[PDB]
Structure 1
Amino acid sequence: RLPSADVYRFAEPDSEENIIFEEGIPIIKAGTVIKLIERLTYHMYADPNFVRTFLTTYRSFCKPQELLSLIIERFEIPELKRFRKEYIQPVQLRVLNVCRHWVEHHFYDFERDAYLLQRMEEFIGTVRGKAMKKWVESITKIIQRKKIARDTFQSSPPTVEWHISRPGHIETFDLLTLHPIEIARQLTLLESDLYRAVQPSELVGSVWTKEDKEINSPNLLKMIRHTTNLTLWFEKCIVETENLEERVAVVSRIIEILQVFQELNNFNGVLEVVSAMNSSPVYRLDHTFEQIPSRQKKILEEAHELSEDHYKKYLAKLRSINPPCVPFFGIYLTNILKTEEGNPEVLKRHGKELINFSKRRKVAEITGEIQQYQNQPYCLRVESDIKRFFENLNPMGNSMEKEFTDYLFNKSLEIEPNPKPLPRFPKKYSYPLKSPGVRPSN
């Protein structure tokens, strides 16, 4: 029935040397690249979970150019009445379905590689056939829509809040001059847009830590860099305020921003404040935290407790709230890296190497959890000048990260030296330190 090895590479029988399954549509555990492509375009049934997971994770084991060459060759299949009807036509329609999902959900590969797109359009444009016309036409319209695209409140959003800095006075914008409510809202819109922009393939096979990270993971990198710039800027605001009374005002203002992040269910923001508060230069400031009111200390402790016991309280709090929210991104990076490190790239059976597909699938299920929260818009107005201020945060300046964190700790040792005495430092703020609070204006 199926073709011989001398004419087709996709029709060798299944064995423990080329394809292994998990414990109805079977679920592939590991297999050769040829075996994966074959099951990806299996003539017996439709497999949307495998199609979706394969196109998200394939870059970890196959190059885009190689995948196109293999699916084109899988399509080219050389009793002839039933051979075309039950084997050639179903496989060719499965190949076209794979091209459709590929161009629709992963167009960035055709954007990054112009020659890849040239080959894909050449392949689709040469198909012809009877039932393939409708397939060639939907695929063509998707490539058209993607090429063109590359080239709203449900209710009244609250009034934008201002404090010392008047609107448009961008040169005075700072932690204590902007309104703490507006800082949290504007940072939540910025973080919400960053969260929503991340694609699942940016998180596969640790590509964001490899040589071509800027191309493969630009949205993920933007998200981690925002977290680093915000957390380090909060710490810099704290240790660079040498006067103790003014430093209490600064730390206390950051706690107020975290409370507005909690009202907004921006967990990403909450844990960036907790991260700055737990950092080595800030966490050891006993004289500063002694002055922080009890209610405010309790708010910071309950925020920390979300992380405790492998984020037990965070995971329970996240699944109980209603939209909108901004989930804590770091836990996904943590669980994905644990998966990448604790599972082997390949499985060996009978001296043969099989790609570990279950490893990729476990990583793809974590990215699916990410995606379930990417359609939650906030009923908040953007303030372009405040958004720009946070987008342009550069606490590190022209320094390496380690050199700047070393400086932050040394500043902490300077402002709060035991048994060395506690020096008094002059005031740096020439405006009122009192917060306008976190209650909106009705």
Structure 2
Amino acid sequence: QLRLPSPEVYRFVVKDSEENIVFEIPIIKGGTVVKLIERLTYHMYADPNFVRTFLTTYRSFCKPQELLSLLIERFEIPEPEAIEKGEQPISADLKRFRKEYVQPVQLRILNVFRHWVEHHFYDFERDLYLLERLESFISSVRGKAMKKWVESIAKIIRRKKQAQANGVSTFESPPPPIEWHISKPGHIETFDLMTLHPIEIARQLTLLESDLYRKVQPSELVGSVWTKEDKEINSPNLLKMIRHTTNLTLWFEKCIVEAENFEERVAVLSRIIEILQVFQDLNNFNGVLEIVSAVNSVSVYRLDHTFEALQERKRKILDEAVELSQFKKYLVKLKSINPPCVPFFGIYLTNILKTEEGNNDFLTRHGKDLINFSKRRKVAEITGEIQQYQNQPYCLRIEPDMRRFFENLNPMGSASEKEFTDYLFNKSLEIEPRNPKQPPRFPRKSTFSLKSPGIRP
């Protein structure tokens, strides 16, 4: 048995009772933040599953500055008191205390620091003081066994700083050629739904929605922080993914309802159905639901005469997409396809939101509240499926002019979201009014041929 310091001066060695930790290598069910730090840096074993889950979900019960304080407090272990050795090293039982407890614990902390800056460097971008403390502390760790960890952490910090100042941290195998229809490359003014190639529209939208999907970190989904006061700071990538799906859905609605001429409106809807087929060929389920949500809106769905003018095979494909999105059948298709894939966030957000409400944040033992860590583990497992599809990229070339075209898509203009949808429903009542109104007469406004080039590459 080692000679530990007093628990009054190093509270990480407090007798594990029921009022500080609850179990069910043991699985941590809950406990105080002091006990969680000790288990995070426990010397008797190494649980990477516990380090990954902690760093992903710790912000729901501990501030980043507070976590760095606890890890530094865990690092600066005061050894017990020999006294005459002052001005010289000490020996005997301190060698056993340093080799079996001090060295492994301090090595566990450096691995926590290394895993922190590697996968969660955004904590240090939002807080420069947090990065200054770590760099100041890392530069003071003495020892040869820790010199490999100190140089490794400082190397990651440098590489991360080079990535933020550059913007990019793009290797492919053989990418297919870029398709073009009426819009010649380099002429962004002629870019439109009916002038660009439907194959390339779905390709560029899949590549853009894939990049937005891969920038989303799991911590942006913990604690429902995207529906709180600081949602713009806590979930910037998740909200940017949501704002893109809403804008593209309204863009598909805007293209359909603003085609006043009947023949031109049938060509636009047919072009969208073709883009839908390439979306499901690319396993872009986000783009599929953008089109499904567009045709399910009150503005588009009420256009009975437009849908009946389509080919039966055109309607069947669209009806199949609306059927499978009802999301009972969306789970079967996603659980059978391999990456590259762009899944739909909205169903995972629902499973997380209902889990945040289905479990209490704090367990209680004897009047002392413990941090319910099991709630954080279940949420972390829902986010684990998202990172699964983010690993593999798409083997598709990026078109810069088309990328910026879809990045800057703002169909609402300066109006709000509810104001724009009312404009779409009023426009739908103009092109196909309610019965018993007569069919209106609108002339062909397109100055170019609306015939589709096709879906085959």
Q: Judge which range, 205-214 or 64-73, deviates more.
A: 205-214
Distance 2:338 2:371 in 1: 40
Structure 1 residue matching 2:335: 3-state secondary structure: helix
CA deviation map 1:187-236 (0-9, x unaligned): 11111111122221122112222233333322222211111110011011
Distance 2:449 2:287 in 1: 26
Partner residue, 2:415: 399
Partner residue, 2:43: 43
Are residues 1:113 and 2:127 paired? yes
Q: How does 1:26-425 map to 2 (within 5 A)?
A: 26-78=26-78, 79-151=93-165, 154-308=172-326, 311-425=327-441
Does the aligned pair in 2 maintain the 1:244–1:424 contact within 8 Å?
no
CA deviation map 1:321-368 (0-9, x unaligned): 233222223222222222222222222222222222122211211221
CA deviation map 1:281-335 (0-9, x unaligned): 2122212112122111111122223333xx3432322232233222223222222
Distance 1:49 1:88 in 2: 23
Task: Calculate the TM-score normalised by the size of structure 1.
Answer: 0.93
Structure 1 residue matching 2:192: 3-state secondary structure: coil
Q: What value does the CA root-mean-square deviation take over the aligned residues?
A: 1.9
Distance 1:167 1:28 in 2: 57
Highest Rg: 1 or 2? 2
**Aligned counterpart for 1:15 among listed residues 14, 17, 27:** 17
Q: Judge which range, 96-105 or 344-353, deviates more.
A: 344-353
Distance 1:18 1:202 in 2: 28
Structure 2 residue matching 1:141: 3-state secondary structure: helix
Are residues 1:432 and 2:449 paired? yes
Report the residue type matching 2:320 in the other structure: E
Give 1:119 shift.
Answer: 0.6
Distance 2:360 2:388 in 1: 28
Distance 2:353 2:210 in 1: 23
Structure 1 residue matching 2:398: 3-state secondary structure: coil
Give 1:26 shift.
Answer: 1.6
Give 1:384 shift.
Answer: 1.1
Give 1:153 shift.
Answer: 5.8
Structure 2 residue matching 1:204: 3-state secondary structure: helix
Structure 2 residue matching 1:30: 3-state secondary structure: strand
Q: Judge which range, 417-426 or 44-53, deviates more.
A: 417-426
CA deviation map 1:225-248 (0-9, x unaligned): 111110011011112222332222
Partner residue, 2:89: none
Structure 2 residue matching 1:206: 3-state secondary structure: helix
Structure 2 residue matching 1:435: 3-state secondary structure: coil
Give 1:154 shift.
Answer: 4.5
Distance 1:243 1:289 in 2: 14
CA deviation map 1:410-435 (0-9, x unaligned): 22233333433143141332322221
Distance 2:352 2:129 in 1: 32
Does the aligned pair in 2 maintain the 1:264–1:325 contact within 8 Å?
yes
Report the residue type matching 2:15 in the other structure: P
Report the residue type matching 2:433 in the other structure: P
Report the residue type matching 1:432 in the other structure: S
Distance 1:21 1:278 in 2: 48
Give 1:260 shift.
Answer: 1.0
Give 1:250 shift.
Answer: 1.4
Give 1:159 shift.
Answer: 2.4
Give 1:130 shift.
Answer: 4.4
Unaligned runs of 5+ in 1: none
Structure 2 residue matching 1:203: 3-state secondary structure: helix
- The percentage of aligned residue pairs carrying the same residue is 82
Structure 2 residue matching 1:317: 3-state secondary structure: helix
CA deviation map 1:102-130 (0-9, x unaligned): 11111111121111111111111122134
Does the aligned pair in 1 maintain the 2:262–2:442 contact within 8 Å?
no
CA deviation map 1:119-144 (0-9, x unaligned): 11111112213422222222222222
Q: Judge which range, 204-213 or 56-65, deviates more.
A: 204-213
Unaligned runs of 5+ in 2: 79-92
Does the aligned pair in 2 maintain the 1:40–1:51 contact within 8 Å?
yes
Distance 1:395 1:101 in 2: 42
Distance 2:304 2:162 in 1: 57
Does the aligned pair in 2 maintain the 1:194–1:219 contact within 8 Å?
yes
Report the residue type matching 2:196 in the other structure: L
Does the aligned pair in 2 maintain the 1:243–1:424 contact within 8 Å?
no
Task: Calculate the TM-score normalised by the size of structure 2.
Answer: 0.90
Distance 1:415 1:16 in 2: 70
Distance 1:312 1:204 in 2: 25
Report the residue type matching 1:289 in the other structure: F
Does the aligned pair in 1 maintain the 2:432–2:440 contact within 8 Å?
no
- The runs of at least 4 consecutive aligned structure 1 residues that moved more than 6 Å come to none
Distance 2:415 2:23 in 1: 50
Are residues 1:5 and 2:7 paired? yes
Give 1:149 shift.
Answer: 2.6
Distance 2:15 2:421 in 1: 58
Give 1:389 shift.
Answer: 0.9
